[PDB]
Amino acid sequence: QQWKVGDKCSAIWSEDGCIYPATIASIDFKRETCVVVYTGYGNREEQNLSDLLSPICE
Ligand SMILES: Cn1c2c(c(=N)c3c1CCC3)CCC2
């Protein structure tokens, strides 16, 4: 997938290694990272772009 800022996705939370819904807050194209915000949980963390999942994965 080609992701954009604001996209809904699912990501693997670094704390528990499980998949959750999130929104892309920003993308660093040089570093190939992004920051996601976990829906309903308020927190954010960086992900590798390559690691994001379809927003249907939950
Ligand atoms: C399940 N969970 C998740 C996140 C949390 N901050 C917290 C929980 C549990 C409490 C904090 C991020 C994505 C999933």
Numbering used by the authors: 90 to 147
Original authors' sentences:
Survival of motor neuron (SMN) functions in diverse biological pathways via recognition of symmetric dimethylarginine (Rme2s) on proteins by its Tudor domain, and deficiency of SMN leads to spinal muscular atrophy. Here we report a potent and selective antagonist with a 4-iminopyridine scaffold targeting the Tudor domain of SMN. In order to understand the structural basis of compound 1 recognition by these reader proteins, we determined the crystal structures of compound 1 in complex with SMN, TDRD3 and UHRF1, respectively. In this study, we identified some low micromolar antagonists with a 4-iminopyridine scaffold targeting the Tudor domain of SMN, and compound 1 shows >4-fold selectivity over other tested methyllysine or methylarginine binding domains.
In the complex structure of SMN-compound 1, compound 1 binds to the aromatic cage formed by W102, Y109, Y127 and Y130, which otherwise accommodates dimethylarginine of its physiological ligands. W102 and Y130 sandwich compound 1 rings. In addition, compound 1 forms a hydrogen bond between its imino group and the side chain of N132. This hydrogen bond boosts the ligand binding ability of SMN, because mutating N132 to alanine significantly reduced its binding affinity. In addition, the W102A and Y130A mutants of SMN did not bind to compound 1. On the other hand, the mutations of the SMN cage residues Y109 and Y127 weakened, but did not abrogate the binding of SMN to compound 1. Hence, the sandwich stacking interactions of compound 1 by W102 and Y130 of SMN play a more critical role in the specific compound 1 recognition by SMN. Due to the electronic similarity between the N-methyl and 4-imino sites on the 4-iminopyridine core, we did not expect to resolve the orientation of compound 1 based on electron density alone, and could not exclude the possibility that the imino group would instead protrude into the solvent. However, the positive binding results of 1-substituted pyridine cores to SMN presented here could confirm that N132 does interact with the imino group and substituents on the pyridine nitrogen would point away from the Tudor domain, as larger 1-substituents would otherwise clash inside the aromatic cage. Although the binding affinity of SMN and compound 1 is not high, SMN binds to compound 1 60–180-fold more tightly than its physiological ligands such as symmetric dimethylarginine or R1810me2s-POLR2A (Kd of 2.6 μM for compound 1 vs 476 μM for symmetric dimethylarginine or 175 μM for R1810me2s-POLR2A9).
